[PDB]
């Protein structure tokens, strides 16, 4: 289709010079294309589609071809449904990879393939120039560029300009959130007429009006008590959505904001997913949080973090990866058809968000803001 | 049955509205906290390190 | 009144240990209150109001007293009309000073003066704790705290909690934009009933839909031609506003965005102010821009800058300060009753905004975004 | 009478829509620029350093 959400395991071991790519191409290393440029030539020539194996998740949307008669510019533009909060001015840089390509037309075209991609933010517009090229082929181009993480989030706009309405034309934005997790935002060109066909990606602010959770006053009304086990689940998956069903719990907001004594809990379920017995791709869950160590009250270091966990099926059984740092963890729910996202109540105060990504569905849970 | 404090109020409370106060002692609790009970029977989590909490404690003590 | 905009010259030379304050208190120096704490004690004890002489501009708004019966908390909250864009994640830190005070009540009150100020942003809430105190007196407190410049802008919320509705109670936020310019955002408490009484501070996005200026197509319609001298002035000062009249020109947007040949111009007037013949306080004009030197296309250093100029009257004559860096400059217009803000057309591409501050009026001109 | 370029298009133009092209030479102008004239009599600012601009220049030249 012209849009969707996919997942796959990413084993760098079995990926030609995988380690090297992730090192010089997806990590903000050298301030020049040379290193990554020379690794891609070796790899991408042996396999022009290798880079697709680096995405743990791929989120694609169908965008209409907008034309510019005067200049003969066929342009596609879109706003990627970024999975999590990019970062804080206090964070470092992300080195994102951009890929523009189209189907190789069986009939030699008039002009040579061409694409100018630019990512614009309210202030600066990062335009992948020539100096950013790290690879080129008849029908494909790859750029590399460092961006302050805080910029990579909703607001950032993606624009690809071609000289023709190339077949199978698409732009991809590879975004590595953690050394071991990469999310790919893709834009597929569709007919001028066609209306934008996004993916089932939602963003949900779980604690609207965080003031409401400043105390235990509304606990009873909200249905967040030691009785129900601090569980107030709401559905995330729409009526037409896939055969899997995801839901979120809002009771944690209390544990993040309350200054009123709350029920002691071993853990807290942030969300659950049903329908694993029929799902055939892994499930990822990324968390965005602030480091626990305290800082100088005179200079509060707001450095944001990200750890992504993955529930996979091995011979029919589902298991979760784990991190001695990650504040959350994935556990099997009632059966092997249910998956749970948990966290220690004491982690909540520093939890900013979590994102649930599985075949055909993506949800961005925010524990701050009201939108 | 056991309730704990996960956040402390950074806002002082008028000693004129603080009935009692107890300390968190349970092992099932993660944070060391002073729980103030108001005159309206409402509890609030506070931080022992903070001076207003301590002083508010010298009042609640030297009155009984 | 309960609100307004003021200006005054700030001569550090004739301000007790002025240099020292600006050095340790308004500059992000030591990561501890000690240095600034010890300078304030010496200065503020000899003069408890000295810090007011450090503000080149003061913008105050009247905020209603919201009460909290349960806890006996009288609280005032507000959104300061920040003069310019704070910064970029790529910028460094600003060390802002916060002052909470009230009138000394002639009748010894029940409890000791108290105030808890906290500045909240969508993500983190910077709360001036005890560890941030750099001064205290019977009816005044001063905090110091470093914040990533990008955070100090519209969105940041100011909240001051007291235990009583102290008379003349107010909170001030001293924000130094440049080593020689300090802007003070103040919140004055008014009666519970009273409605918020802001100041005549406006924010205006000069180039809404910057796409419109991508070429010279609408030049003729906009009235931006070599003829009119690329001048399309709009009024900024409302009908009731002070005896001075300010206006903005939108033609520069073309020079910032156009890829179509434009009329060669020696300079460009960004704004003008009329009524200097009756104004008795200086006029400041701050500019926010990006450094001209180019950077690695692989890593575009987006470090934002600020320079503030000042038109003052000496024996009736008005003159402007100047900067060998500042992209803008202030020149006398037709007569000595008119002031102009100019800039070289080649500066536009890197100009983000400019703010005009004078007795009773403040305007934030933005050359980006649509709001 | 004199017009200059203050921004270059980072977007290539189909050589099929580019009529003529001249270089900025005036001293009253601040940036070195190549001005492309389209088949619709419209001018656009371009950057000489860029290859597509140069190549587009090799076409406009080897056709007259």
Swiss-Prot record, chains B, D:
Protein name, entry field: C-C motif chemokine 2
Positions marked as site (Involved in dimerization): 1, 28, 31
Effect after changing residue 59 to A: Strongly reduces heparin binding
The UniProt record lists the keyword Cytoplasm: no
One GO MF term attached to the UniProt entry: signaling receptor binding
Function description: Acts as a ligand for C-C chemokine receptor CCR2. Signals through binding and activation of CCR2 and induces a strong chemotactic response and mobilization of intracellular calcium ions. Exhibits a chemotactic activity for monocytes and basophils but not neutrophils or eosinophils. May be involved in the recruitment of monocytes into the arterial wall during the disease process of atherosclerosis.
Bridged cysteine pairs (disulfide): 4-29, 5-45
Effect of residue 49 to A: No effect on heparin binding
Keywords: Chemotaxis, Cytokine, Disulfide bond, Glycoprotein, Inflammatory response, Pyrrolidone carboxylic acid, Secreted, Signal
UniProt subcellular location: Secreted
Any one Gene Ontology cellular component term annotated for this protein: extracellular space
PTM per Swiss-Prot/TrEMBL: Processing at the N-terminus can regulate receptor and target cell selectivity. Deletion of the N-terminal residue converts it from an activator of basophil to an eosinophil chemoattractant. N-Glycosylated.
Tissue expr: Expressed in the seminal plasma, endometrial fluid and follicular fluid (at protein level). Expressed in monocytes.
Glycan attachment points: 7
Induction or repression: Up-regulated upon hypertonic conditions. In pancreatic islets, secretion is stimulated by IL1B. Up-regulated by coagulation factor Xa (F10) in PAR-1 (F2R)-dependent manner in cardiac fibroblasts and endothelial cells. Up-regulated by thrombin (F2) in endothelial cells.
Sequence similarity: Belongs to the intercrine beta (chemokine CC) family.
Any GO BP: positive regulation of T cell activation
Subunit structure: Monomer or homodimer; in equilibrium. Is tethered on endothelial cells by glycosaminoglycan (GAG) side chains of proteoglycans. Interacts with TNFAIP6 (via Link domain).
Site keyed Involved in GAG binding and receptor binding: positions: 17, 42
Source species of the chain: Homo sapiens (Human)
Domain of life of the organism encoding this protein: Eukaryota
Outcome (variant: residue 2 to A): Slight reduction in activity
Swiss-Prot/TrEMBL site (Involved in GAG binding) positions: 11-12, 51, 59
Site description Involved in dimerization, receptor binding and signaling, residues in chain: 6
